[PDB]
Predict the structure.
Amino acid sequence: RNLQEFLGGLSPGVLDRLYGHPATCLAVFRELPSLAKNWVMRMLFLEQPLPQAAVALWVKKEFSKAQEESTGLLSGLRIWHTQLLPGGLQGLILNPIFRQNLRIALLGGGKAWSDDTSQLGPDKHARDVPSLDKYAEERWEVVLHFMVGSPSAAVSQDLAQLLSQAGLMKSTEPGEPPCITSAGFQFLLLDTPAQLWYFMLQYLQTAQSRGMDLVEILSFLFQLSFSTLGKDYSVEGMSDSLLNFLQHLREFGLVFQRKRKSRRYYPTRLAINLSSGFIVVETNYRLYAYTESELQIALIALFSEMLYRFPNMVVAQVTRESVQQAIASGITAQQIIHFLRTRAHPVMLKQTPVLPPTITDQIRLWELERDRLRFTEGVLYNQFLSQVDFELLLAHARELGVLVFENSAKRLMVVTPAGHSDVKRFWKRQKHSS
Amino acid sequence: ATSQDIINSFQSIRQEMEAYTPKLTQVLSSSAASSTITALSPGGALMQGGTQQAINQMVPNDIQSELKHLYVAVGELLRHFWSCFPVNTPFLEEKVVKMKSNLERFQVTKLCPFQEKIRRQYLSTNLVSHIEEMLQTAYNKLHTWQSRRLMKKT
């Protein structure tokens, strides 16, 4: 799920409250399609609505589908609203609050997003960008290891409960550590920015359980997205509810902070990417990974056979058996292809496409091997003496929506086990009624 | 170009831009944007969509055949005239005069009834104007050459 899908399902009041922050409006704007952005920019300095036909005539006829999609997305996001123009026409004008906040974010005005930074002067224990990146990577690796369940990863109980709520892991028995499910493997195979966004969406969905304001959290997250790397900001100016969210982000590695009582916080590279190579793939089904961390080694070994582990290199072979085992574990071939494409070494970027077509085709064909046979439990009816009798029962089964397979030539039909009783009762009644 | 007023203007603009501050509201106004969109809307000044909208169906083919015949005749006569040009021998001097007389006779015989027909039917296209431009250019060139010939004899 993406940002637009979540925003579409929100109530109009929540969307209106979201636009009150200049950072939120910019984040929504950058998620719009290319055609929509031009329309928004054109209507930026308009105080009167425009006719729908006039807006529609801007784009050529051949590209009308894209225009319709952009208009529908804008209406769903409530960026602009249809206005009852005098004379029976419908006028389109941007939301005044959204337009004002967008102009403030672009032209300028009001106060800064953050309170201040030079009030406390230079930081006594300021870190460096490589140190922040190392801290974020260590936190993310600790989280992912705790997903696996290694004793080396120790996190808060609230994080474990949140992971359980996300469905990644289940605790069959209290006290014993939870076991990661197939959805956990699929999430692990996902790209890190995708993983961060999915986790944040789950947090937003479950925030109502903790009594936290969705609008404030979204605005703060969007503000963090546009923050400059290596520059700190004042913690003060936020509610105590936002303090818990900030501490959770610090636990997740998005934001660095020396102490809980500290008034400074340093956004990391992960936080910036929240708004949105080391593997060399060879035609002989070999992966050469330039990684040292156990996380990438485990991820690669999930769907491949390891051969050599040099201190700064991993040589693995993608075999049919390993891919079949990984798919039986619950990972689809598309996820594997996407993971390989994302971690692609910069050298492979020259090739078009980056991943050789033969390897992707072979992986997809290996995926189809497991599901060659289709199994559907049901009850077969083959005792039809008359063609007309078969047709009526087939129509009744289709009405009940329990039909699986039909064959009018041989008068054969298959029904679901749940619907077998209903069809049997109907057939008994029809004979009695006859 | 001009006198020291150019240096005065340079100094004035330098002084004005010495104290320069960016503006946000002053960049545009709602009226200006609305006027620009109206101009950029289809059928506007910059977006004139007509551009001989139905010229394929306007000025029907009966006129079009006559227009093509007139174009061919004018092209042939002007080709003869420009082949005669330049006049380097006294023999061609009379030939150019005869060609001009033939051009005038053809114009009076055809274009004037054509102009009357266009005025009666009120065609919006200025088909006559382009033909007049070529004839006017030829007449001007002939008059200029005659004047230069007179200059050589002075």
User: Anything to note?
Assistant: Chain B touches chain A through eleven residues (CB under 8 Å).
